[PDB]
Design a protein around this ligand. Structure first.
Ligand code: HEM
Length: 484
């Protein structure tokens, strides 16, 4: 069937274009007044149709050399399980992670925290330990637009006044980095390269971007295995995972400088760069190591038609880590042929996620660089979408990233593979977390010596400090279940 793009919130399919973005986390205080205000709010919501239409208007305005105008920052909205309960919307959405809420789920994600008996409290910023009912987020070209748009939303809900239907728990702000590295995350890598193409939305998949069915992103659409268990209003909504991930950049840079790979043809500097590339699965530029294993290639990196056309072939079955470690970040989170090829021939479309991350915080200072220690908060506002957090984000984090035997344990489940005997890939070095904060190791990072492990510093390079699981309903769901 064709998708109704006027019904689907625009951050999901399309993505809200942004140099800056504010996420406003709130609690409902008066349910009836909240539902009445939502009638006024809903017309402000950007849909996927809206996105495509804007993108064309920007292209014509830009082809035509006009003086370059304010993209009326787009608004989206998303609700936690605690907010659905609060609103009287009690139909089960058949996802344990969402319904559990991420404060609890975080124990199993591997977040640092502590236990009173069987009660777990993650080591998050104080506001993310309160009940959050939803998030209103607004994304645009500059601070002026976003704030102006957000002030208007706050008038609609009466924020701060005696007649208020929501209150602020906290807010967070993302900002693309300055200049040439605007799309690079704070460790230095080009981010936003690989996302799944969606059948009946993405007209021209890029090479290496196998399109998946829309029900793996949107509830009750084609390919949602849980379609029959879900209520009609859930159609064309998607689960939004938010993770407030702080990055320890000077500690990461220092880590690389201390562990250079000694390899014919490379400086000390270059061996430290090779290690970073191998840990991520790409050069900072964006060039995938599976294509260019030993030196960066900036032209390949800048070309969307060549920079994602690889699948690890049968390197895993053969035990061959020469081009790419098994435990590289991108391989841990999208295995490609490691699982889709023999022996498993597994269908991992339900493990795919659409990422809409934005960076935050200042650049690294001279003092921070000199100390080789972090002094300011910076990192990534991580946001991803799928029709199942249980199958997507949670699983990726627990069974792949945090699992030092993955992917060997997956492919050896079918029968031992002698070239993998004794291979323990190790942790995803970027996001892998060990429960209790124990010792993490990663193997295969030296092309010439695949069995040597690096023991990671106790201070993780990425440190979660907040997050929650939300559901982003359709325009029509909002209109009938959240309005009046
Ligand atoms: C500080 C945190 C993180 C950083 C710095 C980071 C960095 C990156 C980079 C540099 C890429 C490659 C460029 C691209 O394809 O976009 C990437 C891809 C990806 N990351 Fe992350 N990441 C982070 C957290 C996460 C988390 C929490 C998840 C999921 C639980 C995740 C899942 C993925 C996936 C699925 C891909 C795409 C794999 C592919 O299709 O090739 N990442 N990440």
């Amino acid at each position: 069937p064709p998708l109704d793009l006027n019904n689907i919130q625009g951050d999901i399919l399309g993505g809200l274009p942004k140099r800056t973005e504010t996420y406003f986390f709130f609690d409902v205080t008066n349910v009836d007044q909240f539902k009445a205000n939502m009638a006024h709010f809903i017309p402000h919501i950007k849909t996927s149709a809206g996105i495509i239409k804007d993108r064309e208007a920007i292209k014509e305005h830009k082809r035509q050399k006009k003086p370059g105008l304010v993209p009326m920052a787009a608004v989206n909205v998303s609700f936690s399980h605690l907010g659905l309960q609060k609103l009287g919307i009690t139909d089960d959405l058949s996802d344990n992670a969402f319904t559990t809420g991420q404060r609890k789920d975080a124990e199993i994600l591997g977040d640092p925290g502590s236990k009173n008996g069987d009660a777990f409290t993650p080591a998050w910023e104080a506001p993310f330990l309160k009940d959050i009912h939803g998030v209103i987020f607004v994304a645009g070209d500059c601070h002026g637009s976003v704030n102006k748009k957000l002030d208007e939303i706050k008038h609609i809900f009466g924020v701060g006044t005696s007649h208020a239907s929501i209150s602020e728990v906290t807010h967070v702000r993302g900002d693309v980095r300055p200049g040439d590295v605007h799309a690079h995350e704070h460790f230095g890598w080009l981010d936003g390269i690989s996302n799944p193409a969606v059948e009946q939305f993405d007209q021209n998949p890029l090479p290496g971007q196998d399109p998946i069915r829309p029900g793996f992103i949107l509830a009750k659409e084609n390919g949602d295995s849980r379609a029959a268990a879900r209520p009609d209003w859930a159609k064309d909504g998607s689960f939004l995972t938010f993770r407030y991930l702080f990055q320890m950049v000077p500690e990461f840079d220092d880590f690389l400088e201390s562990n250079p790979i000694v390899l014919p043809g490379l400086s000390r500097k270059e061996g430290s760069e090779l290690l970073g590339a191998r840990i991520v699965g790409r050069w900072k530029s964006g060039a995938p190591i599976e294509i260019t294993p030993l030196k960066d290639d900036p032209k390949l990196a800048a070309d969307a038609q060549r920079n994602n056309k690889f699948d690890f072939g049968d390197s895993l079955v053969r035990g061959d880590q020469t081009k790419c470690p098994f435990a590289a970040h991108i391989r841990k989170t999208y295995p490609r042929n490691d699982l889709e090829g023999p022996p498993l021939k597994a269908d991992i479309d339900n493990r795919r996620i659409i990422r809409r991350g934005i960076q935050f915080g200042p650049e690294v200072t001279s003092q921070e660089h000199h100390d080789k220690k972090t002094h300011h908060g910076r990192g990534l506002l991580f946001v991803c979408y799928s029709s199942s957090i249980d199958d997507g984000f949670h699983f990726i984090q627990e069974s792949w990233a945090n699992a030092p035997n993955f992917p060997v344990n997956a492919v050896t489940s079918a029968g031992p593979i002698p070239p993998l005997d004794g291979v323990v890939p190790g942790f995803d070095a970027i996001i892998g977390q060990k429960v209790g904060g124990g010792i993490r190791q990663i193997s295969g990072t030296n092309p010439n010596d695949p069995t040597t492990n690096i023991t990671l510093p106790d201070q993780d390079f990425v440190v979660p400090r907040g997050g929650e699981y939300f559901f982003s309903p359709s325009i029509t769901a909002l209109k009938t279940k959240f309005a009046i």
